[PDB]
From a paper:
Herein we report the first X-ray crystal structures of mixed chirality α-helices in short peptides comprising only natural residues as the example of a stapled bicyclic and a linear membrane disruptive amphiphilic antimicrobial peptide (AMP) containing seven l- and four d-residues, as complexes of fucosylated analogs with the bacterial lectin LecB. The mixed chirality α-helices are superimposable onto the homochiral α-helices and form under similar conditions as shown by CD spectra and MD simulations but non-hemolytic and resistant to proteolysis. While previous reports of similar mixed chirality AMPs concluded on either unordered conformations or helical conformations appearing in a membrane environment based on deconvolution of FTIR spectra, here we reported X-ray crystallographic evidence of short mixed chirality helices consisting of only natural residues existing as helix bundles within the protein environment of a lectin and almost perfectly superimposable with their parent homochiral α-helices. These direct observations unequivocally demonstrate that the α-helical fold with only natural residues can sometimes tolerate multiple stereochemical inversions without significant conformational changes.
Herein we report that optimization of bp3 by sequence and residue chirality variations followed by structural studies led us to the first X-ray crystal structure of an AMPB in the form of bp65. In all four individually resolved homochiral bicyclic structures, the peptides were present in almost perfectly superimposable conformations featuring nine of the eleven residues forming two full turns of a right-handed α-helix including the pair of stapling cysteines (ESI†). The two N-terminal residues and the N-terminal toluoyl double staple formed a turn conformation. In all four cases the α-helical fold resulted in an amphiphilic arrangement of hydrophobic and cationic residues corresponding to the helix-wheel model and explaining the membrane disruptive activities discussed above. In the case of bp65, bp71 and Fln65 the peptides were aggregated in bundles of four of more helices via hydrophobic contacts between leucine side chains.
Residue numbers in the entry:
A (entry chain A), B (entry chain B): 102 to 112
The structure:
């Protein structure tokens, strides 16, 4: 939903 | 996290 959130979610 | 959830989350 946001870029830093995406990184946190994927990792 | 899961594929159908991703679709729902993106759209």
């Amino acid at each position: 939903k946001k870029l830093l959130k995406c990184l946190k979610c994927l990792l």
